[PDB]
Amino acid sequence: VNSFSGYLKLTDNVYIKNADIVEEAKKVKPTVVVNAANVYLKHGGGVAGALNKATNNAMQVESDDYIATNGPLKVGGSCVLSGHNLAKHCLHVVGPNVNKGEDIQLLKSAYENFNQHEVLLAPLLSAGIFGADPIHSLRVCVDTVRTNVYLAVFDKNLYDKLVSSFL
Numbered sequence: 001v002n003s004f005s006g007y008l009k010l011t012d013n014v015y016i017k018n019a020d021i022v023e024e025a026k027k028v029k030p031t032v033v034v035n036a037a038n039v040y041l042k043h044g045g046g047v048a049g050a051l052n053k054a055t056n057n058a059m060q061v062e063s064d065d066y067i068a069t070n071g072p073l074k075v076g077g078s079c080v081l082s083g084h085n086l087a088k089h090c091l092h093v094v095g096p097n098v099n100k101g102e103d104i105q106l107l108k109s110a111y112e113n114f115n116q117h118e119v120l121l122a123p124l125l126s127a128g129i130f131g132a133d134p135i136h137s138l139r140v141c142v143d144t145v146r147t148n149v150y151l152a153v154f155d156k157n158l159y160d161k162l163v164s165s166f167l
């Protein structure tokens with residue numbers, strides 16, 4: 001039993017809700033919140049900008065030190081950093097950005113990072129300003145993640161479409 005509330009169950013291990021991931025993170029305090037990161041951990045907009053703003057820029061400060069030490073992530077890769085006031089940990093995952101021409105096949109590799117964590121609160125990778133089709137992202141999620149994932153979808157219209165079109 002966990003504290004996630006109001007989710008629709010899609011499969012054995014995938015759940016979905018219309019929610020603001022920032023507000024869901026602050027209420028749940030999950031062990032892991034997933035950020036929709038880029039390779040530079042520059043949290044300027046989309047989910048990343050919202051999560052970083054909610055940490056009063058502490059996420060960005062920590063991320064800049066991470067990059068100065070380790071260099072950029074790989075597209076499809078991830079790193080674990082602090083969850084600050086939102087979660088125990090933040091798993092920064094880099095899905096391909098279609099608006100940069102990155103290979104959509106890397107979306108599966110991106111979701112594989114979720115399997116290293118038993119339970120996660122996450123957005124749909126490569127959705128929003130990353131330019132992928134969220135229906136495809138949901139399909140890859142369901143077909144790749146085996147651990148328990150709670151997907152927060154900000155846009156109510158999109159959510160209804162994701163639920164209604166799910167196979």
Ligand SMILES: CN(Cc1ccccn1)c1ncnc2[nH]c3cc(F)ccc3c12
Nearest residue numbers: 021046047050123127128152153154155
């Ligand atoms: C993937 N996105 C955004 C998105 C874009 C297009 C269609 C659907 N969703 C999110 N997903 C879950 N929670 C979110 N909180 C957000 C707060 C923001 F200020 C900006 C973005 C998000 C956000």
